[PDB]
A = this chain, B = another copy of it.
Amino acid sequence: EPQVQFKLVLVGDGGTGKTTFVKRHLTGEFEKKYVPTLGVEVHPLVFHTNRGPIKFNVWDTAGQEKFGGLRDGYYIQAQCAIIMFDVTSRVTYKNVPNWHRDLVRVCENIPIVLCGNKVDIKDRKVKAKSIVFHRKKNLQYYDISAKSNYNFEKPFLWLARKLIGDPNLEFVAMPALAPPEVVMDPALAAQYEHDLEVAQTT
């Protein structure tokens, strides 16, 4: 018996929280592999479902998105992807169409999740209403906070259900995660769950 494993490419502008988000899964950070010529650290994030164990091999840049775009060798053969932006910085959100264009060019029809990071910060600029355009392009969306572990499992559980072809798949146990570095205010979480229902109802 082999191992069920998928290549996942994590992309988005420099400074949005890609490396802080991938590093919450403790054992994946411990067993990571650095490949200098591709400009990547591949993290093996194992998750335990009701039908057995699965492995997401998450590709995280080495910081070469700050002064340029990514090569075709980073994208080739990916089976799924995450695009990230910061919700306190509008320029990171406006570059989302161009990250999506690269994924489509090299990989065609793969399941992709869009993530808005840094929702623990009070003065938010990009809100639920501005994500409607991306949902019409077939991206799935979640509000995330990498520092407090808010909604960490959501992107990986939606991607596992799509790939396997089972809408009733569940995780039976959570992976060991880095302890929260900030508190996710509970009044802000309830308001943002309300914003998303109002924007996407009907």
> How many chain copies?
2
Question: How many chain A residues have a CB neighbour from B under 8 Å?
Answer: 8
CA distance A59 to B138 in the complex (A): 41
CA distance A135 to B198 in the complex (A): 9
Which residues of chain B have C-beta atoms less than 8 A from A200's C-beta?
202
Cβ distance A158 to chain B, nearest Cβ, rounded Å: 13
Whether, in the assembled complex, A50 has its beta carbon less than 8 Å from a beta carbon of chain B, the answer is no
Which residues of chain B have C-beta atoms less than 8 A from A135's C-beta?
201-202
Which residues of chain B have C-beta atoms less than 8 A from A201's C-beta?
135-136, 138
Closest to A165 in B: B190
Whether, in the assembled complex, A178 has its beta carbon less than 8 Å from a beta carbon of chain B, the answer is no
Cβ distance A174 to chain B, nearest Cβ, rounded Å: 13
Q: Encode contact with B along A132-143: 1 for CB under 8 Å, 0 otherwise.
A: 100110100000
CA distance A43 to B63 in the complex (A): 63
Cβ distance A71 to chain B, nearest Cβ, rounded Å: 32
Q: Encode contact with B along A184-202: 1 for CB under 8 Å, 0 otherwise.
A: 0000000000000010111
Could you write out 7 A-B pairs with CB less than 8 Å apart? A132-B202, A135-B202, A136-B201, A136-B202, A138-B198, A138-B201, A200-B202
